[PDB]
Structure 1
Amino acid sequence: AQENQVHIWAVGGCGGEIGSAFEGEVAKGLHSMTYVDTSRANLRDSTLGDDHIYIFKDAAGRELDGSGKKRDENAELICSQIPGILNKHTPGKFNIVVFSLSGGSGSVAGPALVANLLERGERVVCCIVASFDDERQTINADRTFKGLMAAAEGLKRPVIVSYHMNGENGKSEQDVNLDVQVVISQLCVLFSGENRRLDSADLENFLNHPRVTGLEPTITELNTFMGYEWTKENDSPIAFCTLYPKDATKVMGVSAIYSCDGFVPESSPIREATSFVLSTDRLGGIIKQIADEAKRYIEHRNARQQAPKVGDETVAEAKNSGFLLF
């Protein structure tokens, strides 16, 4: 029982915790939100009912209890159950899939949701939080980013990603959550459809940029800025869409292949011009950073001292039940 203009998919524990701040917005009809996870451990106190919560189930129809950072543990079940999620929870006109590249559940059900929505022709913008605390997390993040790039190339439709880092500038998880919440709120205001000069076709061409730009469909990065100071550093984006308050001066000095304009209603919570910029020039740095983390963890792993193994003849001596040598 919520408005379906904007749909938020909280995938995994990181997605569910990030999106827990938008429950009141669902209560106010601003947007609809669906929790997708393999575990209910994080969702023990959510205000939203179980009709907005979907938990993956195994063959026996029993709800799972997390993947434990093992992407291949339940990948088949997730990929098989993704269409049922979209049937039960009707995807919104604009979808904001939030997931973490490091977990074993969000990093699988996130890209699966994105790929299924893109194949259905839906408009989806991802919010991504990547962590590099353990080697398994780094490998999962690298695999998920490669999979998203492959999905963008093979679906002939860009995968728009709002990339965030847990360890960037020494920020805690709370700061990253606040950043993702700001990005999601700005996207919800952009996708509300109440902007004066912004149409559905404009947003369709903005998200599916190669329709107008003609560039190769690849993974695209989304950056959000307030004011006009961002024109100096991102003067050459692929595309950008700006929402202005009342009697706000336009943005100049930006040379983009595609551009859109919108006007915020007088009652909307926007007081300065907000821009949504698409670019792929910073993807190389992200890939290099992920590869550096993977290389660091692999060089740490190769230095592991070999575990002291008991003799093979001792294992022959241990063929009795209980592995007692006597």
Structure 2
Amino acid sequence: PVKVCLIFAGGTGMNVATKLVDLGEAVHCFDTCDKNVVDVHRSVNVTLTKGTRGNRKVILPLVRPQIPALMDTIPEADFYIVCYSLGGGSGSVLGPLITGQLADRKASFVSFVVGAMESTDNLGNDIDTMKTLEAIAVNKHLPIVVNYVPNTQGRSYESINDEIAEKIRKVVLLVNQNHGRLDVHDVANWVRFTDKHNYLIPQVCELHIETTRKDAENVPEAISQLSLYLDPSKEVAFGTPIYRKVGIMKVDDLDVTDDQIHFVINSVGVVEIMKTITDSKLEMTRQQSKFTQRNPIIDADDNVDEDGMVV
């Protein structure tokens, strides 16, 4: 198995992938067409589904039978990262289907998902995709751990994509197997926390990636925590998580970007996130909903034929 396999789906996933092409063979991209394929993608894996050239209900029956074929192109790995938009038609279908397959592999993985906010279609898709991940968490009895990134009004997709790529790199660093005290089994039991803590409920959880003790301590109701420290003198057993582990980073590890990084999983935060999306959409729809069309310009007097022709 490789150390980590990175999986990207849909346009948003393709776009984020462009920022991670230096990871090469470890990167696997999937989409239903080539609208988002650019030259830099030659450096990574790209697979497009057949017969599929925004509506998830339409895309699902077309792509479902192809999933096994997609999975054969994804090597066995010690950890996976999955990335896509919750709000489109392709990423939000391919992403969760592949995620279900990773759960069947008994894999350790996290996802980076975008809350798209443009339209009621985006918002509806966001809701259905979050519900999808919840259903998968239940059906596979496994936490589905996601770093949720909302497209906040006024912020460029470029900016958001940059932030996501930088977080993905921290996870790639986390799982690089080069830290003192930190095992592949330690990582597995961090993210698959219900395996050994059977009294906990598998569900959609959030991943919070923080670079200070203060920010990490402020994650509410933390369930499972992993901390990396460059200066082992700064290690402090803070917070109240059920599961906690620490790794010591190496100063000659060129990928070490920060002095300490905390990866905190909780789940009592997704609620609000969803509420904000529902409330925001409601307000927007209310302004556009409150409509009142005018009366028909044609009366029962006009002679209209079967094609609606009035001659």
Q: Share of identical aligned residues, percent?
A: 23
TM-score by length of 2: 0.91
**1:143/1:308 CA distance change after superposition, 3 Å:** farther
- Give 1:151's aligned residue: 136
Q: How does 1:50-61 map to 2 (within 5 A)?
A: 52-58=45-51
User: In 1, are the aligned partners of 2:216 and 2:264 still within 8 Å (CA)?
Assistant: no
Which of 39, 43, 48 in structure 2 is aligned with 1:45?
Answer: 39
Asked whether 1:273 is paired with 2:267, we answer no
**CA offset at residue 97 of structure 1?**
0.7
- Residue 187, structure 1, aligned to residue 174, structure 2: no
Alignment counterpart, residue 86 of structure 2, candidates 88, 95, 101: 101
Match of 1:302 in 2: 289
Name stretches of at least 5 consecutive residues in structure 1 with no aligned partner: 59-63
SS of aligned partner of 1:74: helix
- Is 1:208 equivalent to 2:188 in the alignment? no
What TM-score results when the alignment is normalised by the length of structure 1? 0.87
2:26 to 32, 57, 66: 32
Residue equivalent to 1:217: 202
Return the letter of the residue paired with 1:10: F
State the number of aligned residues: 308
Give, in whole Å, the separation in 2 of the partners of 1:131 and 1:116. Answer: 24
Task: Please name the residue that 1:85 is paired with.
Answer: 70
Q: 1:247: how far off? A: 3.5
Say whether the 8 Å CA contact 2:189–2:195 is kept in structure 1.
yes
Q: Report what 1:7 is aligned to.
A: 5
> How far off is 1:117 after superposition?
0.9
Query: Residues 129-278 of structure 1 correspond to what in structure 2 (within 5 A)?
Result: 129-167=114-152, 170-213=154-197, 214-234=199-219, 236-268=221-253, 269-270=255-256, 271-278=258-265
CA deviation map 1:34-67 (0-9, x unaligned)? 1101121111322425x71110112xxxxx33xx
CA apart distance, 1:182: 1.4
Q: Distance in 2 between matches of 1:52 and 1:315?
A: 61
CA separation of 1:155/1:315 partners in 2, compared to 1, >3 Å: closer, same or farther?
farther
Question: What are the ranges of 5 or more consecutive residues in structure 2 without an aligned counterpart?
Answer: none
Partner SS state of residue 177, structure 2: coil
The one of 258, 282, 291 equivalent to 2:278 is 291
Shift of 1:298: 4.1
Cα 1:299–1:32 change in 2 (3 A) is: same
Deviation beyond 6 Å, 4+ runs, structure 1: none
Q: Distance in 2 between matches of 1:189 and 1:307?
A: 61
Aligned partner of residue 48 in structure 1, secondary structure: helix
- CA distance, structure 1, for counterparts of residue 264 and residue 90 of structure 2: 29
CA drift at 1:301: 5.0
User: What is the match of residue 61 of structure 1?
Assistant: none
Deviations 1:212-236 (A, max 9, x none): 3331111110001113222541374
Q: In the TM superposition, what whole-angstrom CA distance separates every residue of 1:255-300 from its partner, at most 9, and x where no partner exists?
A: 2110111111232232411110001121121121122134234434
Q: Distance in 2 between matches of 1:260 and 1:307?
A: 65
1:48–1:4 CA distance, 2 compared to 1 (3 A): farther
Equivalent residue, structure 2, for 1:19: 17
CA-based RMSD of the aligned residues comes to 2.3
**CA distance change for structure 1 residues 76 and 91 in 2, over 3 Å: closer, same or farther?**
farther
Structure-2 separation of matches of 1:313 and 1:283: 54
**Cα distance between partner residues in 2 of 1:178 and 1:131:** 16
SS in 1 for 2:232: coil
Structure 1 distance, partners of 2:278, 2:145, is 21
Q: Is the alpha carbon distance of 1:47 and 1:315 closer, same or farther for their aligned partners in structure 2, counting shifts above 3 Å?
A: farther
> Secondary structure of 1:102's match?
coil
Is the 8 Å Cα contact of residues 236 and 254 (structure 1) preserved in structure 2? no
Cα contact 1:212–1:258 (8 A) shared by 2: no
CA contact (8 A) 1:238 1:278 kept: yes
Distance 1:127 1:223, change over 3 A: same
Q: Is the 8 A contact 1:235 1:255 kept in 2?
A: no
CA distance in 2, matches of 1:300, 1:80: 41
Task: Specify the code of the residue in structure 2 equivalent to 1:14.
Answer: T
